[PDB]
Amino acid sequence: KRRNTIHEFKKSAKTTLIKIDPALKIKTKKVNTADQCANRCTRNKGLPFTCKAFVFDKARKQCLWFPFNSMSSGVKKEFGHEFDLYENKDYIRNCIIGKGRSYKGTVSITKSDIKCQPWSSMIPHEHSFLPSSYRGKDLQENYCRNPRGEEGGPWCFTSNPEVRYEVCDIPQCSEVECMTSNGESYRGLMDHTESGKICQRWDHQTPHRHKFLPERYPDKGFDDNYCRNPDGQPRPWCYTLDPHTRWEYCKIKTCK
Amino acid sequence: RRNTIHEFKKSAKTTLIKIDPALKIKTKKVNTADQCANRCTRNKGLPFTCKAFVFDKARKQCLWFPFNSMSSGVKKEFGHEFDLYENKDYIRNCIIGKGRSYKGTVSITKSDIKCQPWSSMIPHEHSFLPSSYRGKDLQENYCRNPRGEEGGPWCFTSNPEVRYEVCDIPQCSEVECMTSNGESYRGLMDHTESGKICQRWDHQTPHRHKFLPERYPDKGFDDNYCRNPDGQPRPWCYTLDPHTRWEYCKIKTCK
């Protein structure tokens, strides 16, 4: 069956990750394209660990899959000409879309600034939200999550014995992103259209062929699948993953 | 005048983020990165030995660090208004000649014996205290050549039966290599074949030139590395000698 999930990733060209923590493990395989790395990364039971990122080794044509990303305290980014780093946005996004069903970031305090209780802990609050019973929901550490996609967004059980749970205070991506005038200068991370369609990566020619090759417009900010306004529009836009919608404008508020 | 920015490796649109919460920095409003560099290298210029700095292009300020990107307590991160500069002496993976200026992190001898810390008198008592040798960076247990002696960087060894031994750090001349005429050379050779220091490509002094890095994004005009952008027999660089506009560099052909 078909996939194509590379658009879920943030690329850092000519970049790899170096271990600080000596314990960290990786898995490798000979693979023809970064797209394949991505698909293997997002499909789990595909790897022995939850894959958060991978490097594509362009010289040796191999994927290096990681249970960590660049935000882990146990690693650091380093330059490497033959390597491209790809990090699944779910884990690094600093904001939520809607109810934040996809949120897998590291915010670990409630709206009232209470440190969250670890999901694997029954203390101080006993509960049935065990990581086991919720696969793909990344109920890891004490991170705010919305495993059942409920109104209110990501939440957590709190380390305070008197407050069983509370929602966390994680802004909508729509409130975090903003642009000036028509957004020609916009270099933000908005990556969905104003109707919620997922953007196509500029570095891809599928499903839509286009002239905006990042390498020939190095000044336009054609990174990943972020909405951009390279051609004098009212506002930024992107090609769409919907084969029936070549491109659509994005919704980005004016700064201030 | 001191002009020392050419001693630094620049990482554009890059800053350093703390992992170790203890690390301190010093800041000041300054007009140019050149000034940050001079302050960074200047003896007794700061409360710590400055290994690196960031130039904040937005706020026009220097952020001086007692650490560089190779410290386990920090990590590089993207930042549009920040340029990172690291003094090459601490990050160089090789020595020039006797390695007088070597301030790297190699800490084993040629026989793979772990070095004894300079501040320690055990197992070998000695008079090479960091205080007696300012600017020689006798820190931790790193191989050093504080007296600029023939054998290159060395250390007292953690082995009680071996007082000291030279370390095994390659000449930069053996680490760097190029193919054909070096048009593709993107290595770190930064002095001419006669040993003159190269001028940074992003500088127009002491020599004015047309090779603006922004105009030739494909040529590898980074820092002051020897490059062959114009079809020469080998890479070259403008030099910091006002009387020598440019000179070829010495780089061996790759094996």
Curated annotation (Swiss-Prot), chain B:
It comes from the Eukaryota. Residues 3-89 form the PAN domain. Disulfide bonds join C36-C62, C40-C50, C94-C172, C115-C155, C143-C167, C177-C254, C198-C237, C226-C249. Residues 94-172, 177-254 form the Kringle domain. This is Hepatocyte growth factor alpha chain. It comes from Homo sapiens. The gene is HGF.
